[PDB]
Amino acid sequence: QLTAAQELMIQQLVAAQLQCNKRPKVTPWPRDARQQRFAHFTELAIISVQEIVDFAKQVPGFLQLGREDQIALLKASTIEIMLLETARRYNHETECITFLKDFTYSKDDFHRAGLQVEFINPIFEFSRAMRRLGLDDAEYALLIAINIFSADRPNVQEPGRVEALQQPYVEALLSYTRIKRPQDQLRFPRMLMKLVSLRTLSSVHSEQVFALRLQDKKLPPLLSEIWD
Amino acid sequence: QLTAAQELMIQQLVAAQLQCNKRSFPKVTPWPRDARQQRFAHFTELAIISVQEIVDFAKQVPGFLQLGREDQIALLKASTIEIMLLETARRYNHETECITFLKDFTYSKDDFHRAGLQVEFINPIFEFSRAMRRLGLDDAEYALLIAINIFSADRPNVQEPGRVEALQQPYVEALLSYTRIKRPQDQLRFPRMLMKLVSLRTLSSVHSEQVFALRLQDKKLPPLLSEIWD
Numbered sequence: 001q002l003t004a005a006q007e008l009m010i011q012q013l014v015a016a017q018l019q020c021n022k023r024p025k026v027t028p029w030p031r032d033a034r035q036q037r038f039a040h041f042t043e044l045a046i047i048s049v050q051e052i053v054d055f056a057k058q059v060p061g062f063l064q065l066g067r068e069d070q071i072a073l074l075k076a077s078t079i080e081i082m083l084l085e086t087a088r089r090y091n092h093e094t095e096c097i098t099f100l101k102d103f104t105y106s107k108d109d110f111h112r113a114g115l116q117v118e119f120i121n122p123i124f125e126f127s128r129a130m131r132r133l134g135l136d137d138a139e140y141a142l143l144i145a146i147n148i149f150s151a152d153r154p155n156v157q158e159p160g161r162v163e164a165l166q167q168p169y170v171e172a173l174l175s176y177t178r179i180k181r182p183q184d185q186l187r188f189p190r191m192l193m194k195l196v197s198l199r200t201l202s203s204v205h206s207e208q209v210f211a212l213r214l215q216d217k218k219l220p221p222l223l224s225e226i227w228d
Numbered sequence: 229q230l231t232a233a234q235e236l237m238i239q240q241l242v243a244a245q246l247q248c249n250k251r252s253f254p255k256v257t258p259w260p261r262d263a264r265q266q267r268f269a270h271f272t273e274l275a276i277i278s279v280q281e282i283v284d285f286a287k288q289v290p291g292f293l294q295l296g297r298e299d300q301i302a303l304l305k306a307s308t309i310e311i312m313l314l315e316t317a318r319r320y321n322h323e324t325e326c327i328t329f330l331k332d333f334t335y336s337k338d339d340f341h342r343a344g345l346q347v348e349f350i351n352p353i354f355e356f357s358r359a360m361r362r363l364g365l366d367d368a369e370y371a372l373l374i375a376i377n378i379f380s381a382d383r384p385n386v387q388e389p390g391r392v393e394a395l396q397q398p399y400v401e402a403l404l405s406y407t408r409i410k411r412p413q414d415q416l417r418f419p420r421m422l423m424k425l426v427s428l429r430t431l432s433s434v435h436s437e438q439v440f441a442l443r444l445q446d447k448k449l450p451p452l453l454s455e456i457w458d
């Protein structure tokens with residue numbers, strides 16, 4: 001059963017998301033060009049951040065939070081929301097990512113703005129895994145809102161309230177996926193599991209030079225010892 | 229209605245969870261500068277046992293021994309910390325607000341902070357422990373969530389991710405059913421468990437930001453603990 005409350009809420013989510021996108025002054029897509037490209041992407045991100053602020057203000061429940069927690073929520077989730085939105089715009093065929101519905105970008109374009117391959121591959125890796133899933137726009141809208149309302153982000157002063165406001169969007173995703181693919185039942189938990197790997201991706205962008213990890217291939221000798 | 233096949237998967241989890249623990253009940257350097265250092269040395273010892281227990285447990289998890297060694301190790305290295313947080317949660321008592329390590333060893337927030345460990349890490353643990361406690365999990369539910377956690381394909385250095393994700397499927401599915409049979413009317417309780425694997429991702433990476441803390445005591449981390457942890 002989609003409740004009338006749900007069915008209206010998802011319409012508001014999807015319309016809020018559309019009304020974001022259709023809202024050019026950006027340095028045109030082309031040393032100078034590799035900088036032009038880099039600044040191109042910088043401005044792509046800048047607009048992205050503002051979209052995500054405007055989407056959020058329209059998520060029932062959001063503007064009811066304390067202003068501090070609103071900000072704390074958006075700080076923490078911007079890069080996860082950017083990632084999810086990019087997966088949303090990933091075209092699996094052309095193997096390309098479409099920004100401002102129109103401009104198309106492949107690995108190579110990103111490498112050529114001088115970008116960290118070590119982070120472009122994860123991006124792409126994420127987009128393809130999301131593709132398998134077959135999300136629609138309601139599903140991403142809903143996944144985003146759930147992602148906005150994470151009680152565990154730093155500087156949340158009212159986590160229990162954040163956590164109560166999350167629940168509406170967890171129920172609606174739960175019902176939407178039960179109606180959409182009723183013979184599956186693991187598509188719901190699989191979507192939510194991407195929020196897990198999505199948190200690890202995110203923490204890699206912001207990694208501190210004093211807390212860099214990555215061991216690579218080679219096995220831990222001492223753990224292997226313990227193993228047999 | 230939990231299938232017979234899942235019940236048995238679950239019995240196997242709960243039984244290994246129990247063989248795990250029963251193993252060790254001590255030789256851990258006794259609880260009391262010297263004061264601080266002997267406390268952290270104690271916890272350091274507790275962490276080493278926990279590693280043995282986690283390795284012993286994951287061995288007994290259906291399907292684990294079927295992965296390649298490389299992958300087996302990779303998976304363990306990356307989850308050790310999350311499993312340790314998940315098992316600290318389970319050992320958390322919200323009336324006394326204490327964590328029970330081993331059997332009957334009892335620790336409060338201030339025990340840990342008195343070992344030189346920092347608020348930035350210890351508090352989130354106790355916040356996370358408290359949150360888990362409101363979930364009301366029983367042992368199967370933990371054993372299952374730990375297995376789901378072990379089977380995470382997106383781990384650093386994993387060569388058969390498809391094989392590990394597929395292994396993760398029967399554990400999610402068994403959790404789903406186990407939760408709907410246990411609170412047939414609280415259908416958000418399951419998502420709320422899954423969201424916790426998310427939280428733990430973050431806790432794990434808050435842990436990796438502790439090196440200044442450890443790199444400055446000038447007595448070294450046991451080497452197992454050194455690699456498991458960096």
Ligand SMILES: CC(C)(O)c1cn(-c2ccc(-c3cc(F)c(CO)c(S(C)(=O)=O)c3)cc2F)c(C(C)(C)c2c(Cl)cccc2Cl)n1
Pocket residue numbers: 038041042044045047048051079081082083085086098099100101110115119123
């Ligand atoms: C240049 C710099 C600072 O390194 C840099 C810049 N961006 C960057 C950030 C966000 C967007 C982006 C994400 C979106 F969801 C949307 C949709 O609202 C849009 S857009 C054009 O308004 O349609 C733009 C594009 C980017 F290129 C990045 C990173 C974060 C790597 C990045 C990159 Cl490339 C692609 C995809 C995701 C991410 Cl998150 N890095």
Ligand SMILES: CC(C)(O)c1cn(-c2ccc(-c3cc(F)c(CO)c(S(C)(=O)=O)c3)cc2F)c(C(C)(C)c2c(Cl)cccc2Cl)n1
Pocket residue numbers: 268270271272273274275277278279281282309311312313315316328329330331340345349353442453
């Ligand atoms: C001081 C040092 C060496 O840096 C350090 C050490 N530990 C530490 C790590 C694991 C365990 C622990 C976890 C378990 F799941 C279990 C049960 O298997 C047990 S036990 C005694 O076998 O019952 C012991 C206890 C600890 F004290 C920690 C941190 C990681 C903060 C820590 C602390 Cl305190 C409590 C809870 C989680 C975490 Cl992860 N840090």
